């Protein structure tokens, strides 16, 4: 990357009027003495006693590739699944012209890491200029909040050094 623009792909306060957007924090991602969460993702949960099917699309009008990241939460019990998302039978689907995937919840007793027996899987894609990405879900979606429009360049890489820049 030679430049990028971070931008609010799906603004928190307006993108999700029918789902809960303020209950999406956890002690595994604690900050400054309080539970928190990733700044670039948004943990949607059920509002009241219902999680209706969401459908949300983004058209890339940035004139360059946009990197979109998202996640899928996998609770430890059918009881916690149900308790968070209402729908026992939930899925998440994500598609663009070139990307296409269906995700289904993985409920498993498993050990705790950073206090959580649940797991979250993280996914990403590069959305080409002019193309559209569409998210549909009946639960378990960790929604994009901010994404990054990228300018590409060759032959670099990553090193580890404690020397001062």
């Amino acid at each position, epitope marked *: 990357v030679s430049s990028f623009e971070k931008f609010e792909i799906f603004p928190k306060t307006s993108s999700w009027p029918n789902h809960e957007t303020t209950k999406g924090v956890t002690a595994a991602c604690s900050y400054a003495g309080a539970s928190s969460f990733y700044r670039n993702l948004l943990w949607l949960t059920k509002k009241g006693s219902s999680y209706p099917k969401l459908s949300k699309s983004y058209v890339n009008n940035k004139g360059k590739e946009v990197l979109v990241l998202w996640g899928v939460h996998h609770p430890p019990t059918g*009881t916690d699944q149900q308790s968070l998302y209402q729908n026992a039978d939930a899925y998440v689907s994500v598609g663009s012209s070139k990307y296409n995937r269906r995700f289904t919840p993985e409920i498993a007793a498993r050990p705790k890491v950073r206090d959580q027996a649940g797991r979250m899987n993280y996914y990403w894609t590069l959305l080409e200029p002019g193309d559209t990405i569409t998210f549909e879900a009946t639960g378990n979606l960790i929604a994009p909040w901010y994404a990054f429009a990228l300018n590409r360049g060759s032959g670099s890489g990553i090193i580890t050094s404690d020397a001062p820049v």
Partner: antibody
Amino acid sequence: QVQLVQSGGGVVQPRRSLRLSCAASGFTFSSYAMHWVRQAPGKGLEWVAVISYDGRNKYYADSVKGRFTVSRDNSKNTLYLQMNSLRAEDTSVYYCARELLMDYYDHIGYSPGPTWGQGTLVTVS
Amino acid sequence: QPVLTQPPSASGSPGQRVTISCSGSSSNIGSYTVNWYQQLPGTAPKLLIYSLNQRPSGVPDRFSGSKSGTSASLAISGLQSEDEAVYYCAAWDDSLSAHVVFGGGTKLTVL
């Protein structure tokens, strides 16, 4: 086979102490918070305390606050309740119960789940 | 409150629908979901409803939960004789030192 079995109950004189135990089987004990809840004969349910899976977080009812201490031993899948400075009104059948949810959420909290033991009677007189 | 407000008793004839209210405050029901339990004489409580509206396996769908403001309600449709029992609600409460609150219980009679 899912099971909770309380033991340690009995008759005791006021001001004295008693320890209760609860043996769990058929589920992963160490993955769940655990509650103590009590009920006096002919009276309503009264929650007593909760302890997190790893013992790092503990909460008590005010009526026993400062007097009782809850603990657990995950290697033996056993929960304990140490009851000190007993009062006559603590007389009750004591139940242990597995927490509702395996993972903790701070907008949801703690609550008794589907699994309760048969209870053990403690009489302070 | 340290203890939630329930009607002391309730009754209905078989086939009828009956509701049982549970009143709290901003720090419990207004903030956290409500569980419902059914207790028959001489037996441990059984979990009926959790996360306000949900049923564990084995619990028929004629049991339903709802809420409004700082109050919640359990509805039982198509009342059956065997449904006669005392029902308790509960919720987490973050006032004072955080704790679980049970209601005083409602004895349901099937006429």
